[PDB]
Write a protein that binds this ligand. Structure first.
Ligand SMILES: CO[C@H]1O[C@H](CO)[C@@H](O)[C@H](O)[C@@H]1O
Ligand SMILES: CO[C@H]1O[C@H](CO)[C@@H](O)[C@H](O)[C@@H]1O
Ligand SMILES: CO[C@H]1O[C@H](CO)[C@@H](O)[C@H](O)[C@@H]1O
Ligand SMILES: CO[C@H]1O[C@H](CO)[C@@H](O)[C@H](O)[C@@H]1O
Lengths: 149, 149, 149, 149
């Protein structure tokens, strides 16, 4: 059972948890958004071959978007976003409202979802986001990260 | 030259940089504070023997404080705080204003320094803060972290 | 691109190289043998689900064998074997003649293949064999290992 | 308590154990030898400054030798040697009789001590020997290694 530095879990305890696990790297990210982040599934790299992980999609009719990294020369060097409860979707607990990624090549994938609530930002100076972990219900209640060299 | 996952660097580009490096674990943290964090030096564990790292002290007449962890049964599981520019000490760039630690034993070392500015929080679910990195001038301009299993 | 401590490469430069990569752990090992080791393919654990890696089989009509580890309570704690050139199969370079595994549960999978040539033994005191690397032609010319915590 | 992949422990159970721990790298190695290896102490690199670890010296009047690596451009890429019991020094258990190092720059520090007994060889394809572990009595009964990226 090898283990991987797991960091954070930003967001609330709502929805059901999920942990896609560790892989060799990240190739593509797919997420839906509107006033908050809804669906979130990612395509990892498993030793050279692309491996699509579990789909954590939500029913909310949100705008979808694909984030294609120019792997393996380009990789996430920063993950930041906003977390706060959502009124329209009657649930008392916090939800990831906004998410925004930044790659080592200078490419930043603009903030998806409203930018309001308490801020969180993970600047990676040395290391690789090798996998995602998080909780999903009708939206993305929380999101976590696996890292390695 | 062996390397360690390095994360963050929360705060501004002011002052001079410093990186204390990687060690086996953390035993004691010493920092001075008032409206922001000033001095910051830590005592690591180098294979069982306590090893005091470089002192990054500031002249500002601030209130000092020692944080003694009950090593190795107790270790930091969360580091959070605030970063924002400081008026009184004329400098245009952001500074770590507040810092607050939480150990796996439930012990939280209350927020030191004013809690205003943009928030940052590093929840550690699996891994160890094995070393600090950061920038100091008259205060603690920024602070970073080294992690490992 | 998430790298993993890679060790050894015991054996000769004959045949074609191959690297199955890193995974979460090892579940089953399949190898054929006679006077030396011929086919060698393994089934890894990818975050809980069994993942069969590339088949590196050889044509030689050798006796096959499956090594099923009681994962995840049981794992390899030692890999040792013999390397030396082979007469019968006219090739001037060394080949892994014998291979023998030992698990943390005391189970040792007896030496497969003749035990002659120069000896090699990797005792693992702390760490996990998380993936194999090696060269195959008509037999297993050499074998390597990926490790992680 | 951060941990490091620890490998091997080649040699016998004689003498008293010792573990110098993990450091940033290796700068110099000092060992004494004759028909077997006697004294063995090393100077590590602790984040840039040379750090001398525990001296594991033996009284046997052996020939001493210093191995200075051109750190950090040069580092051990292979450690091999011989282990077998020693007659002259009446002890029934195995002892490391010979030890030989090879650096990434092509420099090989010739076999020290008689080359007889069972062979052991650790080729490092990716990773760093970051610390030694071993057992010493009147000679070097066994030797182990800590590795990391
Ligand atoms: C209102 O319903 C769903 O979505 C919210 C936020 O995603 C969760 O907290 C909740 O448990 C349900 O899964
Ligand atoms: C005003 O002087 C000092 O302290 C501030 C904040 O610590 C730094 O930005 C600056 O460069 C100096 O080191
Ligand atoms: C004789 O043929 C094959 O097998 C040997 C040993 O496996 C290799 O060295 C060689 O290149 C071929 O692949
Ligand atoms: C004969 O005396 C010493 O040295 C040998 C080999 O080093 C050890 O096995 C033994 O316990 C003593 O420490």
């Amino acid at each position: 059972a090898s283990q991987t530095i797991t960091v954070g879990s930003w967001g609330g305890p709502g929805g059901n948890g999920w942990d896609e696990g560790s892989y060799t790297g990240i190739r593509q990210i797919e997420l839906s958004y509107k006033e908050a982040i809804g669906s979130f599934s990612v395509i990892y790299d498993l030793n050279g071959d692309p491996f699509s992980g579990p789909k954590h999609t939500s029913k909310l009719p949100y705008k979808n978007v694909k984030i294609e990294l120019k792997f393996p020369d380009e990789f996430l060097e920063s993950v930041s976003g906003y977390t706060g409860p959502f009124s329209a979707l009657a649930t008392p607990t916090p939800v990831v409202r906004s998410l925004t990624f930044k790659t080592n090549k200078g490419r930043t994938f603009g903030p998806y979802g409203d930018e309001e609530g308490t801020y969180f930002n993970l600047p990676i100076e040395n290391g690789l986001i090798v996998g995602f972990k998080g909780r999903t219900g009708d939206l993305l209640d929380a999101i976590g990260i696996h890292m390695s060299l």
